[PDB]
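Re: [help] complex structure
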Amino acid sequence: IRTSELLKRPPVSLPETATIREVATELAKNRVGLAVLTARDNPKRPVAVVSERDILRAVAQRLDLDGPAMPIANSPITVLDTDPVHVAAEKMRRHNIRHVVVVNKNGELVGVLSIRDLCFERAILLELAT
Amino acid sequence: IRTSELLKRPPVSLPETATIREVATELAKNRVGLAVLTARDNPKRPVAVVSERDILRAVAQRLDLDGPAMPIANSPITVLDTDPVHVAAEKMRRHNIRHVVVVNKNGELVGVLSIRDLCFERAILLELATA
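Output below.
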């Protein structure tokens, strides 16, 4: 199974100019945990990622949640749409993260894969198990 | 493999009167995503849960983050410390959640199990796949 085969929905993405609350709004609405911030010059080019974890920490620290999201963002960890799903599972495990950003050969955003997408189906489980 | 075998640290718990930001602070500190709210008269008894996802929604809705957490809380979805890990995975899948509250036979809080705990190690995946 390739990572593209498991991608059924578009990822949550926002311009790199997004506020913290704007990211939270899109994540809450789409019931997913990681948002991709995209370049001003290309909305399909990933620049950073913001997790619900980052927003949580912003709340803990009393940051202005209408301020910019980029300062709480981190560099994306990526796999290819062409990569076998075991590579996606390896990066989540080894980087201790619950998502990977799926990009194509040309570096454009294809989707985001969750550990939730890999762990529940028997066929994916058995593939990752062996 | 039992759920108790995969518990890492003591669970994040706060009394049921906790504010939203108090929950966020404790979760941020412990680097985990689910807090258990416990009964005022019994700190061992879970009454509700608040995850980073609930806090996310709170932010999106512009709630007073220094107001009570209970209104944004959910009923605890629990498993026993003696349950096989496939029971936890199934509860996560069927309730569309990424955590479960682990309790003992007397209903006391033992820990919180995450999807991270179940979904990385092969031996565990294998056991989830067999069920």
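Chain B touches chain A at residues 20-21, 24-25, 27-29, 33, 52-53, 55-57, 59-62, 65, 89, 92-93, 96, 98, 115-116, 118-120, 122, 125-126, 128-129 (CB under 8 Å).
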